[PDB]
Amino acid sequence: MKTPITEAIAAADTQGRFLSNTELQAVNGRFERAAASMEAARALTNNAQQLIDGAANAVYQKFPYTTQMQGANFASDSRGKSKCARDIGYYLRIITYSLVAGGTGPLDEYLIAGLDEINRTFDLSPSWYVEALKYIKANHGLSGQAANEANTYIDYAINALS
Amino acid sequence: MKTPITEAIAAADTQGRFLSNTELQAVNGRFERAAASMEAARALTNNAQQLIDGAANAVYQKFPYTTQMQGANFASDSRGKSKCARDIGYYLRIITYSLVAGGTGPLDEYLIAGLDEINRTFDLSPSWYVEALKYIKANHGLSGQAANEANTYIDYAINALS
Amino acid sequence: MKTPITEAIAAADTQGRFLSNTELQAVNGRFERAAASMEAARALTNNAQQLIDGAANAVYQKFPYTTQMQGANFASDSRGKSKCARDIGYYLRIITYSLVAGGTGPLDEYLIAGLDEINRTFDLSPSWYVEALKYIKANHGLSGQAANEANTYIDYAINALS
Amino acid sequence: MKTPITEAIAAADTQGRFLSNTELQAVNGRFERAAASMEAARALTNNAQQLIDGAANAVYQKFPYTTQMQGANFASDSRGKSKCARDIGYYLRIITYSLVAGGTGPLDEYLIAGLDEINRTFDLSPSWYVEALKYIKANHGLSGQAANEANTYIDYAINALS
Amino acid sequence: MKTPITEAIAAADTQGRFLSNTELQAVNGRFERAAASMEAARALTNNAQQLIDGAANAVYQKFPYTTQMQGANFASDSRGKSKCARDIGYYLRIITYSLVAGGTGPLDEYLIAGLDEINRTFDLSPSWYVEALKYIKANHGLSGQAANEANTYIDYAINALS
Amino acid sequence: MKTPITEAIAAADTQGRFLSNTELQAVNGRFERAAASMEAARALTNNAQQLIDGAANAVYQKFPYTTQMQGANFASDSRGKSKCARDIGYYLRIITYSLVAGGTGPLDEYLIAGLDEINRTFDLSPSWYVEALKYIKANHGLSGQAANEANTYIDYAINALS
Amino acid sequence: MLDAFAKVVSQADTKGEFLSSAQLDALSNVVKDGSKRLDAVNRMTSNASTIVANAARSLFEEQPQLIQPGGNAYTNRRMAACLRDMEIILRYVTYATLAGDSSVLDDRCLNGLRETYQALGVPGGSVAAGVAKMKDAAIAIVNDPNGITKGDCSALVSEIASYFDRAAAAVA
Amino acid sequence: MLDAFAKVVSQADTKGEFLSSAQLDALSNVVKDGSKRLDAVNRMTSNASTIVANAARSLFEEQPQLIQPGGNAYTNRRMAACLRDMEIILRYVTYATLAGDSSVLDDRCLNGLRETYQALGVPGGSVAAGVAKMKDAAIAIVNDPNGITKGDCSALVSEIASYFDRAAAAVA
Amino acid sequence: MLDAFAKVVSQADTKGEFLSSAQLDALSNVVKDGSKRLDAVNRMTSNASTIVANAARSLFEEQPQLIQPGGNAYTNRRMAACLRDMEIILRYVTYATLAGDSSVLDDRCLNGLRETYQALGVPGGSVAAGVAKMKDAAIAIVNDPNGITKGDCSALVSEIASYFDRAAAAVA
Amino acid sequence: MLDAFAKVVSQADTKGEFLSSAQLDALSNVVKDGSKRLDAVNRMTSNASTIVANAARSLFEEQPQLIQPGGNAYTNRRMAACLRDMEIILRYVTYATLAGDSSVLDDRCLNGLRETYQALGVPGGSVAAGVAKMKDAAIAIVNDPNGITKGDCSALVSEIASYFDRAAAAVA
Amino acid sequence: MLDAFAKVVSQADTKGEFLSSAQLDALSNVVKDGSKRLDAVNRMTSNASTIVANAARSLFEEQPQLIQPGGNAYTNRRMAACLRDMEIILRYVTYATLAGDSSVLDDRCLNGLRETYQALGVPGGSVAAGVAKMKDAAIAIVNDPNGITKGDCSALVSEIASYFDRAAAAVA
Amino acid sequence: MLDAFAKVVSQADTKGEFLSSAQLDALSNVVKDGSKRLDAVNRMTSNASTIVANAARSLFEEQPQLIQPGGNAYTNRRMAACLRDMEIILRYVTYATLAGDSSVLDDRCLNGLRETYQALGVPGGSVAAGVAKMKDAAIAIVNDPNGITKGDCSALVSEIASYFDRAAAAVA
């Protein structure tokens, strides 16, 4: 999986050479950022259920037609609400994985790869998930470098959707 | 030239994507190491002439035949001594360049690329330069991370020669 | 542009051979289908404005939020309605082009190539155009092979969107 | 084997797409030509032995040296006459196969591929077979599109030999 | 042009190396064979017209139909006889060129390359030229290594035709 | 292994053709040179031990530091002298192999391939072996083409080292 | 690959004889029934997307262990791969229907698929269930009598069902 | 490349308007006259070998300086190249005749041919003479009234002659 | 490509002398101001999509002749190409901002772009207008004082504006 | 390949749950001990050449049948190949030490090495002896207390020895 | 590949000793008899076409089931392939005759031929019969005493027959 | 490429006539003087390394501005490139000497070298000086009378000097 350490090792391996000072400097920078990364990860994991419920409710309020239109891809019944809550939980959990791993490897591997085809096939709108992620970014309750890291990963996900 | 910033930019460019968090972390690690890098560079630049003279003298003492054998590739006359001093100065200056730039880019580009062919063609021994570099490492008079960086680059050069 | 005649000529040219009986048979089949193709093209061209207005109105009735939500990509104002009418006119005109040319060349070249990126960037939903095309198919007022051809091309466009 | 249906299927498969309207039009054109194709095939099959004997006799009359010169590749004895009759029968049978299949697939696969090397190795003249095919074309006794198809395939074979 | 010296030079050049002892040995072997090569070349050049006339006459006697059949590719008139004499002269002259150059370079470059297509297009039989070359080999009047070289090149030409 | 016969066979095989006159001429040149080759091989094999001892002694006299400096790569003890004698014996034996085989195949395969890496890793000087080979060339006691061949192969080895 | 005409020609050439009257009559009958085959292929091609989407939705409702965390279809990448495989199977079934012979389907799609799935770890039973659902949907769409000339298509539907069952048995 | 239908569609799309009744009527007329075009293409394809051989023989009889020692067609290799070029020109003329538009002929064959011949040293006048002889032979074969339904093909013959003259002028 | 450190090292090696104290002090100052550069690059990368979309919308509102039938951006393919080009220009501007030197931007993006656009027929004035709009949006986003430590970024903003104007002048 | 963070994330995703506090604490401990790992990697990389040369010399002194005429290391080419293999093994051990997990070493170096050596005829026991000598030299160099901050590196040395023994057992 | 000189040198290097007098005398004898080998190779190369044609004709007369409809040589393509294979076998026999060692013949031609023929379905007995006929023809041509210096070539003919029988046994 | 025999054959074929007695006598004279050419080529090949090294040393002593910091030969890479170029020029001179014609030297080495050096910035005068020094060294080595049969080699030396001067003039 794409992490800074594995990226440096792969870069060194494709050339058949030992590890230079640049790879060690990159690993050291990752270790320096790890403190804020773990702070953000703990803050996001501790309040997962409240964030999921709030993001779902925000999606339901901004797009009220998603709870009234009769369809398989809408949340007009309990099955649709369960699917939406599951999707938001998946998004939050994978964002936490990316925060812990120190890179966008989990985001690219588990969620982004193949997202457009799924959204087209099952008739889902990226705007719903963009609104949910915007709520999560506005209400994660962090400050400083931890907030900076969380916002960076949330914006990466949003730019992937948009 | 191969520097951490240009390496990260090239890695991002070969994939046609924006700069991720890993490249920024690598650049931050380079910036953290820059303090020791500049300390070592200043210490090596301030005492360049004394180090060059001492390294030359050490080479002359360890291999006494280099000052008595009659040949074009030996230092038995003033021309050979001038050439040896020039070579040691080149080695020290390029090591300083590598220390400042933050990577082995200057070392690979200006000195290492094509070294074996030159040593074979003009009948020069890598052991002389290894001894000079060992003297420089033993007598640069640094302590701590600056000494660590200087020793790392000197060992890179030595491993290139050996 | 991808037409049956040009497709046959390109197939013959990539092998460096003359035109065989199979290419002539394909061209003859195209000529046999041309009667129904032109019938459908005339029927669709004669009632273009009514079809465009009806398809727009159907989109507005099925998705009522597209006329009330405040946004740049919605038809809540005159500019959005003009853009929607222009889009539906483009769809109908390119379908007519494909009917006349005898293949999906115009559809693949003018509309389908790059459709997903545009829909993602400008935040447009393929379901609106699917509903408009469904209305057009239900209300083009043809019968027989002309209706068969028109429905075939409309379904090709719909499958491209879905 | 190269038939219009298999050609269309292969063209669709090399691009990883479904069958478009052009392939169906080509298959329909093949089906329209199939009537004349089968008419010509029946007419050529019903009078096979007479055509073979006549074509052989025409070759023997136009090149009288083929029945007097002493050689392994000449028809001066019973073995050579048997070989010539067998060759003419092969030509007629493969032409019938091509007429039935709707393309030059059987002709390219069973007869044309490797014909020049065989004619050079065993010292055979293409002019003999050209004369036999010309007799067959002049005496197959067809009229209309069936005659057109038979002449087209015979001319394809002749151009292959010439 | 393909000569032993140029072949050795090209072999040395494709590897980017100097000329080794093997290339010099090959050139020396060519120089040793050059005596017989020039002997055969002189013997064939001195009696060119008689050999050409005899080979033509042999072709006319073995295939008597070539002087009676009415056609553009036959020697039934003065134009055909002139063309046949010109062809036999070309064959003999190029064989002499190959003998002088020390290899089959002239034969492959001037005559063999494209021979089959010409023989098929203009309806010429390789057996005529095979008979002419057989007469030339039987009546060149050489003995020893010169005869060996002449026979080797004539057999190379014959195998090219057959 | 690279010998003139195998080189000619490989050249003929990469083009899928029979053996031409040029390959036979090259083999004949090799056979003509074989007499001097075997003469030189016998002369070098008969006096192997004396040549090895003399070349070793010449190396020890020209570079006297190789018998006094304390090191693993020097001949200051019995082990180093045994290693040097073994190396000189290897050089002479492989030169004899190359003389017998008629090409530089044994020299390129057994000795030259990978020589620079070994000399760099184990800290050996090519000048020692150059001096030994120069002594061998000056004291092999041959005259004529045998001496020419021996000198050619010794110079090939020297140019490989230099 | 081989269609009906190529198959008959190949057998006749292997036996080395002219085509008889029975074979020519059978080929004439095959040619006479080409319009129904073209209609079936066109309808399946037009409704492919809905067929695939509905079949996938039904399959994931019947076997919920595939989309659970840790399943074989739990990611966007693996879900896209599953949809792509189902679309490929439907496409090759349509190719075989147009050709009139299952040579292309057996040679280019079903050749060595079971071993590939075993190496990857893909459950073949779920794939067979999805293929059966696609078969039912496609057969129901083909036999739609609205907006088409009335006729007999029983043999064509039976043959299409045969291709679908062959694919399901070869992948299971 | 573009044929008549593609050309009309391209102009209509560039102007951004639906096709009018005149353009549709012209395209219907083009479709109605397709059998004659198919016959012309079939006849030219069938007689291509004889056309090329006769044209080459006539060209080398009219200009004997080409096959003389030192000429541009004095070898087997160069003679084969000349025959190949003439066959290629005839093939592309047939392609343009089938398409109904000279886009393919101008884009894939005649684009940059004069400069290539100038660099190689090939005389363009002899090539133009050979093209004219091929044109005459092909036109004579196309207008053969034996074993075909009687009709009017004057426009088709004029168009084919136009393509041949265009090729001759572009290569000269 | 070259950044500041590589540029200084290259000039010093060309002159063949050790680095002086002034150059080392300048490089130390460059290192000391790296956090602001990282923040600017991060903000531009995060807001790239909105920047590009808003700039394209504004450009097509100001110059309506581009999206009209027959325009240079009238298709889905050409519109996608235009958006891709704008995104590429923004990406290379971000690369140059991170490097601290415009070598990569001038060597990999702006080298020979005017001739390519002239050959294709792309109007350079509209591209320059779009680049200016992107510059304004990016500069406004970078100088946002919300949720960040207060400081002085005037030199960084001036340098970024210099890169944007260089790109606009090189493409016009 | 996988390091510690990637391994933990992969197991958590397979089980489909958030990371607990124990895993986060373990990862924090791993991050806290990164300086020692960087020092170990740097020292091994710096002394690689001497390690390889000394190990090869010792191996050829202990088993003299390898460099004898007819041995598996009797040429310059085969000796260079042996040195290259030892250097590759050391390089991959350093990669695994930096990663903190033996996934890369087992996947890119030791995967199918025994079969390759068996096919070539390379004795695995001598390779194992050389690997053991390299292990001893590298461990002795890593634990050098001169010119470094005093601390505890027992776990790191044990882990490095584990990687070396794993390589030796996988190649034997 | 290896010839006699390379073989002797390889064995001497494997044993690690200088060549003795017996080996040098044997190599001198091999060199002394090179003219006969060159004559044999030249004659076989010159008569290759007639050898192959006559052998193929005789083989198809002796076993008429190969050229019957349905046979393994019933087409122009398969007949050309059979002639090509026979020519390749003769060419490699000539290569081995020139080299003086059957290494090239066993390594480049006969290595894995039986399995290839078994997979394709080619009968090996007919190939062996054709090889035997080619052997007889080539031997008869080589021993022709007309227009050549009289001498003893018994060993050369025996060796050539050995190569031919080796090929026949390896392909059967 | 062309040697003397190929050149004469090419002119004779262009004129389309048999070779006369004068040309055959000239070719016989060329063949008679082959041993001296082989000796010259062998000596130059054997002494190439010393020739190149001495010429480079002399050139860098005469023009010290090349190896100064900032020069065109101030690095290990550029010095290696310069030595490689000189070795290539000597190698092609030896090729031309063996061939007896300067076609290969003019076609594969000196074709477009001046423009390449102008684009790169390599001074041609220094290259010409190095070529002249190599010429002097090679001529002095070739005319060494020790350990060789006494004879006349004046024409060969003049021709070699002509090739060297041609290279020097073409590179300047």
Ligand SMILES: *[C@H](C)[C@H]1/C(=C/c2[nH]c(/C=C3N=C(/C=C4\NC(=O)C(CC)=C4C)C(C)=C\3CCC(=O)O)c(CCC(=O)O)c2C)NC(=O)[C@@H]1C
């Ligand atoms: C059987 C699956 C269903 C069915 C089909 C059916 N159609 C006819 C009539 C026609 N179908 C076509 C369709 C095409 N011909 C082509 O070339 C192409 C591709 C370019 C298509 C799509 C045509 C032209 C006809 C004839 C004209 C007409 O409209 O009638 C029949 C009758 C038998 C026949 O062969 O024509 C049948 C059975 N109808 C059903 O009810 C079945 C469900």
